[PDB]
Every structure is written in C-alpha cells, then in structure tokens.
Amino acid sequence: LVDEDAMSQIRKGHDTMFVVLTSRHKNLDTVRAVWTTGDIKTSVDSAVAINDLSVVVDLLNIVNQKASLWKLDLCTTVLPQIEKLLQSKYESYVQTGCTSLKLILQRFLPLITDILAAPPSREERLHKCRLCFKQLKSISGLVKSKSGLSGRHGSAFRELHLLMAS
Amino acid sequence: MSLQMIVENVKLAREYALLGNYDSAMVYYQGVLDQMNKYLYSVKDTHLRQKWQQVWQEINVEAKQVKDIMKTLESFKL
User: Which residues carry this modification: Phosphoserine (chain B)?
Assistant: First the structure.
C-alpha cells in the first residue's frame, strides 16, 4: 500500500484509542483506591457501579488469581457479572466469566449446599447462600439455553454445562 | 519494511489493548514502533518524514497509556 493509505488507516483509530484508554485508566484508579482498603466486595461493587465492563473484566482477571480473597458476600456481586460476561461476543470475556464461575463453584458450593440443607447471626449466612443459589440457577439456565446447540463459544459452554450438571 | 505489516501490527496492538491483553499489546506496540523506526530511517521525502514521525508520536502515546495501565494493575496487591 501507499504511504498516505497506510498512515490514514493507522491514524483513523488513534483518537478513540486515546479516549478509551484514558477513561479505562481513570476508572481503574477509582477501583484501585477502594481496593487498597482491603474491602474486596466494595471494590467490585464500585467497578459494577461505574459500568465500564472492560474494568470489571480487568478486576476479575486480578481477583480470579487468589481464591482466598473471596468471601461469600462477594459471590452475590460477581455471579450477576458472570451471567453478563457469558453473553459477551468476546471469547476472552466469556473465559473470564467461566474462570470466576469455576472458582466460586469450587470454593463455595459445598458451603452453600450445607447451609441450604440445614433444618429450620446465622440467618445472614443462610440469606447469602439462598441468593447465591438463585443466581447460580440463573446461570445454569443460561448455559443450558446455549449448550443444546454448539454456538459461538460452544467449547466453553459444553464445559460449563457438564460442570453445572448438579 | 512492509507498510501492510505495520498497519496490521497497529491493529493487533490496539485489539489486544482493548481486550485487556496488555502483555501482548505491549509486544505489538514496541514491535511496530521498531518497524516504524526502521521505515523512517529509509524515508528521504521530507513530507513523508514529517507525517510518519507524527504517526510514531501517536503510537507512542498509546503504548505509554498501556504501560501505565499495566503499572496500575500490578499495584493491586493480593
């Protein structure tokens, strides 16, 4: 291609890149300022309120690395974000949601099952478990709606369907 | 240098950055700046030199933005 053509093709996207990255960094700075308090759930809630999905993804990619930072309460915020990410056109967004979902299932499903199986302070851990179960059931319905036929992210949804077959 | 290759590598750097794959974005940003540096070295036309240097400045802006985002992400302690 000619120089003028190559440069035009390159320059066309620069203004958007600059603005998108500036805004993303501003939003990450806000989230980071809450994160340093050690209140992980409030940090994630702040990211959700800002409603920059790329920042939710970046933050989950961080928290997905250390399951020990997850409290039961955090699942009530993350599960709805997983459902949203599982409907993304971006394979990497789906993958981030799948990773968060696998972490939650491995860390909290036994506890959730124990709490919900108990016979009729403590009513707060029970309340959180009941909410997590309904949110997990919602994701289960989504995965089942998407795995009967191999779709855009068929491989990821086949794996999720098998994992959640319980 | 192949201009088509430079265009493609800018596109890939930007796509990785937009999708939060900052490690790969930086590889492509630094790689394409090296390619533009080599191309500029061959440019004698003064008008083309000015214009390609301006592209080089703009890509540097984006690359620095990604680097600074990565620094902030690394600041999240687990």
Answer: 42
Query: Resolution, in Å, please?
Result: 1.5
C-alpha A157: how far from chain center: 15
Tell me which residue in B55, B59, B66 faces A21 most closely, judged by beta carbons: B66
Exposed/middle/buried for A58, CB within 10 Å: 0-12, 13-18, 19+?
A: buried
A100 token code pair: 């968060």
B7 interaction partners in chain A (CB closer than 8 Å) = 1, 6, 9-10
Q: How many residues does chain A have?
A: 166
* Contact present, B66 and B73 (Cβ < 8 Å): no
Interface test with chain B among A14, A59, A95, by most B beta carbons within 10 Å: A14
Residues of B in contact with A15 (CB under 8 A): none
Parent domain of A95: 3-163
Are A56 and A81 a contacting pair, CB within 8 Å? yes
Contact A40, A69 (CB under 8 A): yes
- The technique by which this structure was obtained is X-ray
For B35, half-sphere exposure in the C-beta direction (CA atoms, 13 angstrom radius) is: 18
Sign of CA dihedral A43, A48, A51, A54: positive
Q: Is B27 on the interface with A (CB under 8 A)?
A: no
| Number of separate domains in chain B | 1
Asked if B65 reaches chain A (Cβ–Cβ under 8 Å), the answer is: yes
- For residues B40 and B49, the answer to whether their CB atoms sit within 8 Å is yes
Count of domains observed in chain A: 1
- What is the span of the domain harbouring residue B14? 1-78
Of B20, B59, B75, the CB nearest to A61: B20
